Each structure stands twice: as C-alpha cells, then as structure tokens.
Amino acid sequence: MNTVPFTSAPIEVTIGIDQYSFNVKENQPFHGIKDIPIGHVHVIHFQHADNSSMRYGYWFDCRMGNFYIQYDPKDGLYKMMEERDGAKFENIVHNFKERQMMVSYPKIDEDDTWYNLTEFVQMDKIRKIVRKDENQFSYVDSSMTTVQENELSDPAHSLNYTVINFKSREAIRPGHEMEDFLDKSYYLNTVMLQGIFKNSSNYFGELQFAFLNAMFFGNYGSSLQWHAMIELICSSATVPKHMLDKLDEILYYQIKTLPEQYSDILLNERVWNICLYSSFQKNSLHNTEKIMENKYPELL
C-alpha cells in the first residue's frame, strides 16, 4: 500500500483520489494520501476553492516511482514530482504517518469499482496519449484538447487519443462505401483492432481512460472519444462475443459511477439512444441498458 505525500496545502482545494474526494482548508496540516492500492493506475485531482475553473490532476502508478505533491506558488497549482532518493522519501512518509497527517485511501473491501473502471488502463498507454516523457506520471486538465479537436492548437499539451472518424478514407474502403458506412465492422476489426490497437485490451484501455478524463476533469474531447469508441463497436454487425460481454461490464460501471447530476453534460443522447435501441448491438448490452433505463430514463 503506497503513499503520495504532500509538502503542504497552502491553498484551499478539493482533492480527488480516484472516485473519492476530500476538502482541504488553506494551510490545513495535510501531508497526503496513504494506503493507495498497488496494482492499479490512480488519478490525484484538484479543484481550487477560489477558482473551480481548471479541474486538473495526475495519472500515476506507485510501482513506477515515489511521487509527491508540492504547491508551486508561481504556476499556482499542485504539482506532482518524483523523489529519486528512496531513503529521503521513506523518512518523509514515516514522519507524516506517525503524526497522522495523511488521509487513508478509503477503499471498502467488497468494492471493485476502481478495478472495474481501470481494468484495461495501463500507465504505459496513458503516457502515449499524454506526451511528457521526462515524467512517469501524466498531467490532464479540463481544457486540454485532443489531436482530433486540433485538426478541426499547442501540440505538446494535447490528448493523443486514436482518431476515429466515420466519414474518413480510413473508415471506408473504396467500393464498399455503403457497406462500411452502415456496418463499421471493417473499421473496428481490421483498421482499429488488428491495425492500430493490436488487441481489444488496448482499445478498452483507451475507452476507459477517455471516460475517466471526461468524468474527473469535464474534459470535452475525452467525452467525444469515449462516445466514438462505444459507437464504433455498437455500429459494427461483427464483434467478438467476449468484446461485447466485456463492453457491457465496462459501460455498466461507468454509468453506475457517473454523478447523477452530470448525466446532462457527460452523456450524448444520440449515441446512447442509437447504441441501446437502433444499433446492431442494441440487444447485446443487457447490464448497461438496464442501469441506463433505471438511472437516466430522461436521456432515453
């Protein structure tokens, strides 16, 4: 069980750790988060009490290094940093633990929610979507645009999600225009799965990462990417049975976790109505359709 110490909390802030969140007061003796489960990616995220504009945060995996948070009063944010001195870090953590100045990652033993949201998400894939190769952790915020949003503007600060475009030469084989447009199986199975992702695990990892950026940062481009990856599967007549069964589980936990009060901005009516009620896979997402119908019947 690993630890992300904080040097201090000089500004009042709501701190997120995965699906959990805590209010910290200006200059409160807060020195970080302990008992973080090993084996998963995590996200530590922030919303300043004085400017709720820019939710921002860091994707990290404690197996890859010793990470801490320190407020930078010049750039005006909480920054993640790596401590390369193992003994310095262990001594910082032991002191803060002994003084009980850390919040405990509040996982219920029964509760598989975070595993279920991050099942296919791997730090090495996050670091290819979020390019900052000198850090082992990845910064995301509310305002970062995607490579696709930028085509239609600072490339270094972009989310390099896989570009999905249903009306593109990549999506449509010459001479199979109607076939490929109405049945996206070619695009899903040959171009995306065999060609770019190599396997359904990488595809699901990107889908899950896009959802979590949408939910945790209100990142609009991430939400677009999450819906596009759902729609590409639901709009394919030919999908491996294991991919459909897994997609139903993935989406079920995403819908279960979504704040009820953000359904209006985070869920695309057209995509969801099409996926559950008109698409080839309209009858393949039993769990998702049941939770959507019981939780968000207005949207449908």
Add this chain to the structure above:
Amino acid sequence: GAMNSSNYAELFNNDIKLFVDDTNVYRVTVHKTFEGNVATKAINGCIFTLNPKTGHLFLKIIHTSVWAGQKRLSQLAKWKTAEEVSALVRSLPKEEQPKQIIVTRKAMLDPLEVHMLDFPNIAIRPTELRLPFSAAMSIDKLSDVVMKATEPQMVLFNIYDDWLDRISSYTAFSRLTLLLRALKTNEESAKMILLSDPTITIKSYHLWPSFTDEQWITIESQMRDLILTEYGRKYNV
C-alpha cells in the same frame, strides 16, 4: 452550408455546381398478388443531375436490373445515386468537375459525402429550396428515354433548349422551376397549356416548344394561374 432564398444568385455565378435529385431513382408500382398480399414491381428510374448555369442535364438512367436480388431498395437507391454521381464527377475533366453539389433531399448528404471522400474540395450541400425536379419524368422525351432503356445508360440533355441565347441563367432556371412546379401540381393541365396551339412545335433536338419571347410570357402566366387555381383547391382558400 444550406442553399436558400438568401443565396439564390449563387446558382448563376461562375463556380461549376450541380443539383442532384434522387426522387425518380427507385420507382415502383404497388399491386395485389394472387393470394391478395401486396407486392411492388420496380420500373426504370433516373438520377437528375443538373448544372443550373448551363442547363446541362446528366440523366443517368437506372435500369430495374440494378435492384435484382437487393434488399432495402429505398436505402440502396441513395447509395447507388451517390455512386453514379461520384462516377460522373471522376469521368469529367478536372476543369469541368463541380466545386459544389447541392442535393435536393437531406438523406443524400451522407451517401454522397462518403462516395466523394476522394474530392475533399467539392462541397456537398443541402438546400431549403423546394425544387420540383421530381416532375422531370413529366417531360415526355425524358420519360421516353428512361422507360425504353434496356440497360444502364447516361443521356445528356440541355434542359433549357436554346433559351440561354435570349435570357440569363437566372431567368432560364425560374422558367424551368415554374414549368416543373406546374407539371408537378397538375400534369394534364400543364401539358395542355404547353401543346394546346399545334403551330408551336418541339424541335427534334429540344425538350420544350419553340415559343417566341411573347408566347413564353403568355405560357408563364398560364402556368402561374394553374399553380394558384390548384392551390385554392388543395387548401379551400
């Protein structure tokens, strides 16, 4: 974006453009079967592809053989239209390729966009205009070449005959849309007006009669009267 009353002069500028109307591509007669069920029999159709500036009509005849063994024909008809328009564009020399194609029905946008991905600089546009191009099959010579076709065929017409010698494209298009609107509202009455005087004939190489400028004014008034009479019936006003 969409073509409307506000940007109407754009039709007659020097940017090559084509209207595409798919309303006569898939045509059927509905009939009773021996067992008293209903069935359709397809008849020959056509794509109506028109340069509104020049009058050049690219009438692609759609032979019933293209539907044999196919499902969801009304959906296929949009994709076959888009395939044939894309083929026509690729067949034209670059300097003759349109910069815009305006579809008369919004259901043609995605099929045409997907077929034209190779032509990213050709704008595919809808229109708010209610154009009466469905009535093309009320022009006797166009109906005749479609119904007689025994195979897929492209036939080239000038739908304005020689009008552009005397009038502007704007006026030629206005005349054409008024003629087609009349033919669409009351075909019998419209054709009576066009042929009632046997001294005015249709040249072998023309679609419409050889009216003098004064005779066109009379004809155009008779067509407007036809459209208003019919409208006062439809609506009881």
